[PDB]
Amino acid sequence: VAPTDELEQQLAQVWSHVLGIPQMGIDDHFLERGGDSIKVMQLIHQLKNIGLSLRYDQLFTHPTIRQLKRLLTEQLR
């Protein structure tokens, strides 16, 4: 439930901010914590402000932080 790297913690924090609820786990489902389309916009907006971007449909196919973490193709040997 707890984040591992400092990036996953930062991602959990922005998540907590958008949803108005602290300490977001990486297995909590985004659509199970009150996420609307307007809240998705706040995430996308606040992500362009700090970090990279994100598309609307990419959130539903990666509706967890673990899946969004794996979706790093946007940015083990």
UniProtKB/Swiss-Prot annotation:
Domain Carrier stretches: 2-75
Top-rank lineage group of the source organism: Bacteria
In-chain residues carrying the UniProt-annotated modification O-(pantetheine 4'-phosphoryl)serine: S37
Domain notes: Two module-bearing peptide synthase with a C-terminal epimerization domain, which is probably inactive. Each module incorporates one amino acid into the peptide product and can be further subdivided into domains responsible for substrate adenylation, thiolation, condensation (not for the initiation module), and epimerization (optional). At the N-terminus, contains a N-formyltransferase domain that is probably responsible for the formylation of the first incorporated amino acid.
Function comment: Activates valine (or leucine, but much less frequently), and then glycine and catalyzes the formation of the peptide bond in the first step of peptide synthesis. This enzyme may also play a role in N-formylation of the first amino acid residue in the synthesized dipeptide.
Oligomeric form and interacting partners: Large multienzyme complex composed of 4 subunits; LgrA, LgrB, LgrC and LgrD.
Family: Belongs to the ATP-dependent AMP-binding enzyme family.
Further facts: Linear gramicidin is a pentadecapeptide antibiotic produced during sporulation.
Protein name listed in UniProt: Linear gramicidin synthase subunit A
Native species: Brevibacillus parabrevis
Gene giving rise to this polypeptide: lgrA
